């Protein structure tokens, strides 16, 4: 949560949303819309899938150790190998533990950084055009119809041929 | 005929160095210490069973040493033995 | 010595408190010890970056 | 730092702020005033207030050992115990450092993104009534007064009954 | 990649560039131009230049150890410091990989970050004279010659004596 969008100014979750993670909803003239965009959610997902397999690429192959169980009691011997054995899962509890950790927080930081690109991608999309209302919500200042909103989401939008109305509507 | 907002954070007149990824001494506002490194040079008798040896190690208590015989059924959960601890019975 | 108090960690240098999670006074001890390290100090940040004025 | 709030645009901290640790300071017609932004500090000091207990639960409970000091020579054995006992030395040597570096740098991120946050919060209330300075300070361009200042400082501000004097100062 | 500069909206980059790290390249009415930010590029660098001696400061000093290769067949002592051996390299070379992944990342968001950090501050300082045009390029809508571009590079541009014109373009 190092950007503020996820459980930031977005303040909620849609689970209406199965499409994909990252997505709109649009309000125009014609009515209210949904989608999803594939391509955030492609790389928050690409970014997540292994994570793990990259620190751990896979599990190292062990035959014959020492033994960890002992019926009678011995001394010195069987002290370091009981000392051996305790550090060794110590060690390891350790490490899993901090890699869980650290890799939960990377996590969060990098969907709530997914989220805030697609966001500042939309905004510089709409440059003049729009303005953001603080809840993640961009409000555009002009006739946007269904042609208008995908080509916002397509990433195709010409703020151009808008930007006279849009001045107009904002500025009076 | 307007006004002036500033947004600003809290600082200390002194600050304490710590060591980041980035950088080998940086001042942040407030540290704690995370290495105990001294000690009160005296064993707490709680909450632990603890068993001074005075003048006897635990082999010579074993043993039955005459000079340890204060020790005989002595239970503990440590056994402190002494420097100044000394055999006085059959080699 | 021994002395009339409560720890739960001991070490031969004594008895320690154990709220740290590190130790530099001894590799010997006894009870809930913190863990011993080699460096004798480890400051963790609890603040932000101190910029003062000037 | 990776925001470049604190330290960054900011430039300087408030040591005569002691309420909290991020807040306001404002100019209006009716004079200067300080206030500490709560919400902004606690998050920070929640997020600080563990950070340790999280990767370390507690200390391990280690009652009979190995024996790590001798006084004769031995051999195989007291080699192999004193090699087991600096591996393991060495070994939480470098997780103790590891972990401090990590936590410091993840702590110095994250109060730079509290700032940060405050900062992008403030900004989207002030719609299009103020403008940022480039010194963390933003300039309103309408009368502002205390209740005013108080009511952005509480999250209420109503940029619309201000947007036409806003404007009309700032476009001219 | 957090912030989405860097193989982001800034989408390429300028394989001329050898003076420094970041930098700026302009178009005006006298003639292309380019020049590097050095101090973006000497904080990188600097960030960049240990972050391996700040978590494994110096190699530690080994003299005497345990025998690591055997002729014949013992038993348990051979056993016990085989398991040591291995378990002491298993755990080192899980540090180095996670090490080494840990500080990929964060140099990779480090340097995202300072590219960011570039382009807003640019942004700040062009308060109302430019549009950020989506490519990581400013539009600025003003005569803006040699020195008023070498300005903003220096820190030293002064937005109120372009603020008139550069209104009137783009608001006409
Ligand atoms: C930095 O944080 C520490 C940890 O809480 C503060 O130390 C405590 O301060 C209170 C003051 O009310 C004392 O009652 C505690 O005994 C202190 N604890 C320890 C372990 O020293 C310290 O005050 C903080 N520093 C600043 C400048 O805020
Ligand atoms: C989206 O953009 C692509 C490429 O510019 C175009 O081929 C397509 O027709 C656009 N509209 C869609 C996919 O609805
Ligand atoms: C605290 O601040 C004073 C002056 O503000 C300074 O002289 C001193 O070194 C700082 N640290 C301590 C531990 O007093
Ligand atoms: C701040 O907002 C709360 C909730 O909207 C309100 O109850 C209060 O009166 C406001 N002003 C303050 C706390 O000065
Ligand atoms: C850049 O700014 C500095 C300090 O304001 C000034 O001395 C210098 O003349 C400016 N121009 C340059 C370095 O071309």
Redesign the interface.
């Given at each position: 949560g190092l950007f503020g969008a996820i459980a930031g100014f977005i303040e909620n979750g849609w689970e209406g949303m199965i499409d994909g993670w990252y997505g709109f909803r649009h309000q125009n003239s014609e009515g209210t819309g949904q989608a999803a965009d594939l391509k955030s959610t492609q790389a928050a997902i690409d970014q997540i899938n292994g994570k793990l397999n990259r620190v751990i690429e896979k599990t190292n192959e062990k035959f014959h150790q020492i033994e960890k169980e002992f019926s009678e009691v011995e001394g010195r011997i069987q002290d370091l190998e009981k000392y051996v054995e305790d550090t060794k899962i110590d060690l390891w509890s350790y490490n899993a533990e901090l890699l869980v950790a650290l890799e939960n927080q990377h996590t969060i930081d990098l969907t709530d950084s997914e989220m805030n690109k697609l966001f500042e991608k939309t905004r510089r999309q709409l440059r003049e055009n729009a303005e953001d209302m603080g809840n993640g919500c961009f409000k555009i200042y002009h006739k946007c119809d269904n042609a208008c909103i995908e080509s916002i989401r397509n990433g195709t939008y010409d703020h151009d041929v808008y930007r006279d109305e849009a001045l107009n509507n904002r500025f009076q | 005929?307007?006004?002036?907002?500033?947004?600003?954070?809290?600082?200390?007149?002194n600050?304490?160095?710590?060591?980041?990824?980035?950088?080998?001494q940086?001042?942040?506002?407030?540290?704690?210490?995370?290495?105990?490194?001294?000690?009160?040079?005296?064993?707490?008798?709680?909450?632990?069973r603890?068993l001074?040896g005075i003048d006897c190690t635990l082999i010579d208590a074993l043993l039955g040493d005459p000079h340890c015989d204060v020790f005989q059924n002595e239970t503990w959960?440590?056994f402190?033995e002494r420097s100044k601890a000394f055999s006085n019975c059959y080699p | 010595?021994?002395?009339?108090?409560?720890?739960?960690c001991?070490?031969p240098?004594?008895?320690?408190?154990?709220?740290?999670?590190?130790?530099?006074?001894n590799k010997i001890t006894?009870?809930a010890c913190?863990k011993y390290?080699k460096?004798?100090?480890?400051?963790?940040?609890?603040?932000?970056?101190?910029?003062?004025?000037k």
């Open positions: - | 005929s307007t006004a002036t907002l500033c947004l600003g954070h809290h600082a200390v007149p600050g304490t160095l710590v060591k980041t990824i980035t950088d080998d940086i001042e942040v506002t407030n540290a704690t210490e995370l290495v105990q490194s001294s000690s009160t040079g005296k064993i707490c008798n709680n909450p632990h603890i001074d959960d440590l402190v | 010595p021994i002395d009339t108090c409560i720890s739960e001991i070490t240098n004594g008895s320690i408190p154990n709220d740290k999670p590190f130790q530099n006074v006894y009870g913190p390290v460096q004798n100090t480890l400051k963790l940040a609890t603040g932000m970056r101190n910029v003062p004025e």
